[PDB]
Write an enzyme that holds these catalytic residues in place. Structure first.
Site, mmCIF file in Angstrom:
data_model
loop_
_atom_site.group_PDB
_atom_site.id
_atom_site.type_symbol
_atom_site.label_atom_id
_atom_site.label_comp_id
_atom_site.label_asym_id
_atom_site.label_seq_id
_atom_site.Cartn_x
_atom_site.Cartn_y
_atom_site.Cartn_z
ATOM 1 N N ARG A 1 45.312 42.052 49.901
ATOM 2 C CA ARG A 1 44.280 43.045 49.465
ATOM 3 C C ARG A 1 43.159 43.179 50.464
ATOM 4 N NH1 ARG A 1 44.852 41.035 43.613
ATOM 5 N NH2 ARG A 1 43.189 39.664 44.444
ATOM 6 N N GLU B 1 44.685 25.837 43.420
ATOM 7 C CA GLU B 1 44.636 25.008 42.194
ATOM 8 C C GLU B 1 45.676 23.886 42.187
ATOM 9 O OE1 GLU B 1 43.955 27.125 38.613
ATOM 10 O OE2 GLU B 1 42.853 25.331 37.993
#
Ligand code: NA
Ligand code: NA
Lengths: 183, 183
Positions: free
Chosen positions: B68, B105
């Site tokens: 993006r 994560e």
């Protein structure tokens, strides 16, 4: 513009793309569009030539596939004054999507598009960096047409016609415009 | 431009971004920049505001991370007249690369950059869509500085300051400019 001057600009764009030997494997030549991106003159020329080609076409939306497609699609959308709609691998778009499968060498993959981003009426240009086998573009076309968009045009920086992409898209009623091609 | 008119343009950009509840999981709000991309007025405004912010900064290169980030970086590079240099997940860039790790994560990932695309002297702007934890941007900075580029600026459409990104980048001497922010 004179065929002399057009040829000089197109040559400047082609000479900006590097050819890498034995990538991704032995006996394959890889055409690297990143050397074009780093040259502002070549990058800006490629956007101008793509956008100008479609300036009378009544395009209302541009669609590009992730990731290198975003590099050409989204500036073409900006140059045309129309929205840009990404087509992404699965699980990246957060709103309601539809999906289409395509073949890779060793398996299948899917592309998605936001169902709200294409509606009946839309005249859609597909842009991508490189046309090789055409499988992702054939999937994208299906996605756009399922949402009622009309697509008859796809544009690329590079065409590798020997891999069959251009011929496959033709079978779906797609006219392809490529700035350069290689054997 | 009057604070009235600047506020109206910035509001038009912010109202174009959708908030998706419970995505990617329950109790998380996701800010979707794709509704901004499909609105030509909001997309073109966001590029104008980003490029104008740096018009006197002596930027010689823009770097954006996949995917993006390419959506904002590459039009900003075009607007500034400078090359665009992608930072990609591993095994996608074909020429000589260097690499940097970052935390996700549940594991680690790496980003790469072409070693030939940044050289000593270059003044590099980093652009991305959204600043969250800042881990990819912190990696990118390291990459640019290893090749001798100077980077003190990173620009985003969206900042989520509560996730700590802006504060982390500050520790590396990066000034961040974001068009909008959310809590
Ligand atoms: Na629709
Ligand atoms: Na270098």
């Amino acid at each position: 513009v004179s065929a002399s001057k057009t040829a000089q600009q197109l040559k400047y764009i082609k000479d900006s793309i590097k050819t890498i030997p034995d990538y991704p494997k032995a006996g394959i030549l890889f055409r690297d569009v990143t050397s074009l991106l780093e040259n502002p003159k070549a990058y800006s020329a490629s956007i101008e030539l793509l956008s100008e080609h479609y300036s009378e076409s009544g395009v209302t939306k541009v669609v590009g596939t992730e990731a290198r497609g975003f590099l050409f699609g989204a500036p073409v959308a900006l140059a045309l004054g129309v929205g840009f709609v990404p087509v992404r691998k699965p699980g990246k778009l957060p709103r309601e999507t539809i999906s289409e499968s395509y073949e890779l060498e060793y398996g299948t993959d899917t592309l998605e598009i936001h169902t709200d981003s294409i509606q009946p009426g839309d005249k859609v240009l597909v842009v991508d960096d490189l046309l090789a086998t055409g499988g992702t573009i054939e999937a994208t076309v299906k996605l756009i047409r399922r949402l009622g968009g009309e697509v008859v045009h796809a544009a690329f920086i590079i065409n590798l016609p020997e891999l069959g992409g251009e011929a496959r898209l033709t079978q779906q009623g797609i006219h392809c415009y490529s700035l350069v091609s290689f054997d």
